Design a protein around this ligand. Sequence first.
Ligand code: AGS
Ligand code: AGS
Ligand code: AGS
Lengths: 734, 734
Amino acid sequence: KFKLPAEFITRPHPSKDHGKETCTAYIHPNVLSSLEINPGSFCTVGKIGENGILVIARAGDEEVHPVNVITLSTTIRSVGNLILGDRLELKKAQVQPPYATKVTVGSLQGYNILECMEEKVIQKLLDDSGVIMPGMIFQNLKTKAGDESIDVVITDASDDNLFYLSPPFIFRKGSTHITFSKETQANRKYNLPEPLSYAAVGGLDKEIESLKSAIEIPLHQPTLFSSFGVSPPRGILLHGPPGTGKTMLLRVVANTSNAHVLTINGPSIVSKYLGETEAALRDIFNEARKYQPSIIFIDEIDSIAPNRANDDSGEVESRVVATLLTLMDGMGAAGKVVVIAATNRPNSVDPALRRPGRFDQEVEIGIPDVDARFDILTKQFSRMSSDRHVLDSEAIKYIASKTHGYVGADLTALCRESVMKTIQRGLGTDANIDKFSLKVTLKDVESAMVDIRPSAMREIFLEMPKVYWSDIGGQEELKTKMKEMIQLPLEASETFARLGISAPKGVLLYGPPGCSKTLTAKALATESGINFLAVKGPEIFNKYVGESERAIREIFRKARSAAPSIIFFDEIDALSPDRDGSSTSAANHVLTSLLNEIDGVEELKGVVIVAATNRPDEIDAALLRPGRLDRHIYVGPPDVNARLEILKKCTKKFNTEESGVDLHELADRTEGYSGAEVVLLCQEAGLAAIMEDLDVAKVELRHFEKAFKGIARGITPEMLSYYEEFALRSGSSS
Amino acid sequence: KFKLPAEFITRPHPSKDHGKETCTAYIHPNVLSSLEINPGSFCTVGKIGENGILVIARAGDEEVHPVNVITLSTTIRSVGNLILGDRLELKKAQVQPPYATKVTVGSLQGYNILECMEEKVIQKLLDDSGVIMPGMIFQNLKTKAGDESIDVVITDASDDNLFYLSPPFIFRKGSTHITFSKETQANRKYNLPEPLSYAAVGGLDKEIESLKSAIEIPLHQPTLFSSFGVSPPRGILLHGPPGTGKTMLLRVVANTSNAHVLTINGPSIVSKYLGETEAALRDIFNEARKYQPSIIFIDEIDSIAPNRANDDSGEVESRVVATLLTLMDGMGAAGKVVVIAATNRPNSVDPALRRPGRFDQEVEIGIPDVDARFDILTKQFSRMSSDRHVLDSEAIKYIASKTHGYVGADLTALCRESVMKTIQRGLGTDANIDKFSLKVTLKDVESAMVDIRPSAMREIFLEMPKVYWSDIGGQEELKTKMKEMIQLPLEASETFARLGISAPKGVLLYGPPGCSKTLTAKALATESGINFLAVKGPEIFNKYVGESERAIREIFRKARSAAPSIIFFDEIDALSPDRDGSSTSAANHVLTSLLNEIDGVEELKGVVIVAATNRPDEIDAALLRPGRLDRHIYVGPPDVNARLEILKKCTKKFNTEESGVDLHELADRTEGYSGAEVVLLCQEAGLAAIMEDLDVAKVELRHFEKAFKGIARGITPEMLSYYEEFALRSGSSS
Ligand SMILES: Nc1ncnc2c1ncn2[C@@H]1O[C@H](COP(=O)(O)OP(=O)(O)OP(O)(O)=S)[C@@H](O)[C@H]1O
Ligand SMILES: Nc1ncnc2c1ncn2[C@@H]1O[C@H](COP(=O)(O)OP(=O)(O)OP(O)(O)=S)[C@@H](O)[C@H]1O
Ligand SMILES: Nc1ncnc2c1ncn2[C@@H]1O[C@H](COP(=O)(O)OP(=O)(O)OP(O)(O)=S)[C@@H](O)[C@H]1O
């Protein structure tokens, strides 16, 4: 008794697609007999659990075709997004689709179908197709010039449903109005599965290029590699943050290639007892060997190959890893098969799968930067941009600037929640709203992301508030010094590379606490015209595996790898103290990392290391001397006019001037109050404001008078003396 | 009711000769019945997780044949390289394999079969064989008149749904041509497993023969010891750094020796249920006793048999070690059983497990010598085709001498990376180039070696901007003496050896700050070729009771493992406080650990120490003693002719001579300057020049004139008199 397989395997149809064989997917005649299916008859082909698609049953050769294999012309696989290795469910159809009266025909790129190709050849393809559902493609179509490939998609067909993903219509010549259209997708109401192509993967062009090379080299041309007697780089591994296009990159690799896509599912490949896990792995790799070229995907390989050094690993992990070691290192030198693995983090995968010959090639998928978010946002925003009509591309930069932490996944969730808030905006404006009349808006998008948890954390990007050289409080002497000395060496970069001389290394920005110290570095991050970076004091300084001597190296590597940078070292004096008999901290590592990084082989073409301090006498002597820091200047608390404009800056939502006391009046009233202490006076006044009216009021002069009492003179002569004592040393050769 | 085994134990036939029993697998009657494998019918037997071998089933004697065992001939086992004790599946094949048309036969020995044997012999062998598959070896066939015996191999088989490891074919006398060949292995098309052999192991010759002796006598000649009234040595332990080839030895021992082969793959036996790990060990040793002779392998013994006295070893480790101890020497007997184990940490193995009677022998497997590395490289490169282009001896000998501290895994990685480099160069030439002819040229090996790191050196991070002797201005005396120390003793080894003289193995470079002290160490590092470990003064002054001495000892351990190597102790004055009043530092014992490591009860052969101090008399007389720091070199300030060379080096990208800037005047007027101050002079003149312009202003003598006005002489006459005084009491006749 012949046994009918439950699931059939999609595979190419060596016959051409231009013929009458569009929906005549050849089926093994034994299956045709065993399922009461007549030749040239319609039957439903579809993935498990999905709505069916219509194919015409045609008998194939018994010997050539194995029983399971079902061959589809490449026109119908694109209907239901049938990629190779997709298990099917053959069933017998019962209703013959009616003929067609109108068909709207699309194109890939919007090319004028009238101008490029004849109507006769298009009609020939369509008629010979016989039955047309919305969603196929007619490929490799020769044009009038003979050198252009334009593909005929079909947007819709109308005649003047259940368990069918789309209802076809039997295209017949004579009255079918073939009205060509610029739409690049099938009819939207049915929503036939959209391919996840390369143009939906934005933000990882370099990484996708590396992945493409790693897939092509073992997949298409392993023979010429194998002549050398050492196995190809079959094993590729993807790792990085657990939100950045990992499974999506695997899915696009599945879609684009024409290589038989197998899949090593994590949980479902394993049944029970013995000889089931190894049986599954053997069978799947053997099938990937029979049908070539093939890709073997292992998404989240960690869930089945932990280190065996953790209590998680049991018998099953030992089975999976042993079988994979036996297989992946055994096959080769002729098989056109690649194994691609991805993981949230790779470091917990058994090394036996990581040695060369096993997964040894790597693709690093990294956090998207501020400039990286633009492509993600715009391409994500494409699916309905015709109904956005709001972008104009400028809000996208703002979003990218304010989404430090989002990993692309959260950006897509932001799109989802924005669409929700647009639906609810339509409902709130009018209960019986028409959503299609709505264009999404940035205000409701803001009302949207104000209710999502952003991401894991922010690593190389900070708030970086907008500060300008046009607003920094007075101190035109400070301004002129910092310009002359930190922008000139950042201008002369090639002229140092030629003439062979290293560039000045950095400035230390002497000054008492609470000044514009780093708030000027905020302008460096806003209006310098040069990208910025910082570590706000002893974050990296702490004693951890990746902080003792590693995080400094990573920070410098990111900064140097970028365009010129003004890397910042807030309170370097407190970070690494003198440690020469006075204030001996226990780190001993971070200063060594800085010493080995700043002075060494690295290029550091576009890099200047700025730092900040309020107790400069505590800096390690290895920094003051030229070689690590060789520029040195002093920042003072704001002068009377700088204090005028800092007083202006403190207020952001108060009307003291017109109602109360002029801000201009306060300019000289504030003496001994540092840039972060005039803030203290203003904030004490603001807290006192909510004590008199308690709901809504201006402030009083006496509020600022109480600010004067409650906060004594901040900038006292002690710091003047301590500085000038240190400055007679720093300023002079002593 | 009868329960068929889930996995089956391989075993040999009692009959060693060739007949109609050859391709027959003797399976138990009940198992035959339960899979319905009717006697005489075809069945497939193959390791779990691999493709099967077709074998024709017979019955075993139901009372003396164990249920688990299938017995297979050496001919069949040669196909899949099935070692005795391998766990086989057994599955019915409802098939009749195809007839043969042309069968190819070869011989391991490569001798002409027409000359050695009569074709009727081969015809009879094949006819009786019943089945033909590529990969079969018919061993011990006698030559003409019994001259010798030859092994004959079925290299290929051709005929003009199950899946098999080798194609099954049938021999039908006369109608299938027995075509001879000289290929000593089966056709490479088939991916047949290829036996690993001792010829693939490099070096370790004496260790290999020790393994041969301790494997052969206990298993294959015990009555010799029973005759001599002594017990057999039932234990071998292999210890040595990782990557030296310990598992390779175990696999070759498994595949070469004719014995029941069992493996405890450390964590593979472990279970979370109370007594199951111990029960796995008992079953393994009882199986070894049952089928004799038997070899039991334990790779990483330390993973399952820890010290049993240390803190983390609780009751579970105690019970597992007790099981191992009692199964090796207890109230039970051993039999013809030998246990072979491997470990990277011999002292972490339980001390009572290494006593004679258990692991009697400890065959050390250490890092390779230059001869050993040459052997490994020749055997690795013998695996390739005639695309090597590395002269079998010369180029490989250069690569072997240039590899210092390599262990053997890294050498295989180097060969694979060389293949990678050659083929990426091929891709960079053109994508469609005929790669196979892209011989790996020695420069490809060089490009590969710069991208690999010796096993003993992954953790030795260095920035090391590739300093060369010519960078050091002058100092010809120091250069000559450092050539004496580092280079010559290896480039003239036989001369020193024949004179009975070991070259001095310590030097102290002392002199004012900013001379060529550290730069000469870096020049040695990046010109001597040998490894180079670096240390600094206060980086190894942890504040715990014994953590600094541990740093010293770890450094010297790595230096020994990576010898030839330099250890450069910059700021050796930090490591040498007397603490009696001279350098009254903390109560640390770093000096003593350094003293004992340099010259103690252990010898420290092969390492050379270079120490640099700018305060030479603050060093202990014991450390300056010959045998610790033999030669004391005074690296003083550069004289005029060295200054001129410095200026020529750094100013070459200036157009000084085209501008009339006479370097003679600069050299003469920079008298008594520190050489670092000469470099500073030129770099500061460059700053001055490129401060007037953002474009390239060629330096001018007046910018140098400005420079001279600021750079103070860092070397006072006091320092010079001090160092010249130390250069009289020590390292001088006085
Ligand atoms: N360039 C991009 N970077 C990141 N995500 C993107 C990008 N482009 C689109 N996305 C969307 O990101 C969403 C989530 O990405 P996924 O790859 O599915 O997450 P993941 O890679 O599975 O993460 P894990 O937990 O490490 S497996 C998808 O629905 C994509 O539509
Ligand atoms: N002559 C050789 N000596 C050493 N290794 C060799 C040699 N020839 C090849 N190799 C390779 O080097 C490795 C030797 O096996 P390894 O298991 O890595 O050594 P081992 O680390 O001492 O054993 P372990 O730690 O129990 S896995 C393998 O990857 C071999 O392919
Ligand atoms: N012949 C030379 N004499 C002195 N310095 C030289 C010479 N040639 C080059 N230099 C440069 O001068 C500087 C001297 O640096 P080092 O070699 O570290 O001197 P050093 O005496 O080891 O300093 P220490 O160890 O901190 S006391 C480096 O920038 C060298 O590149």
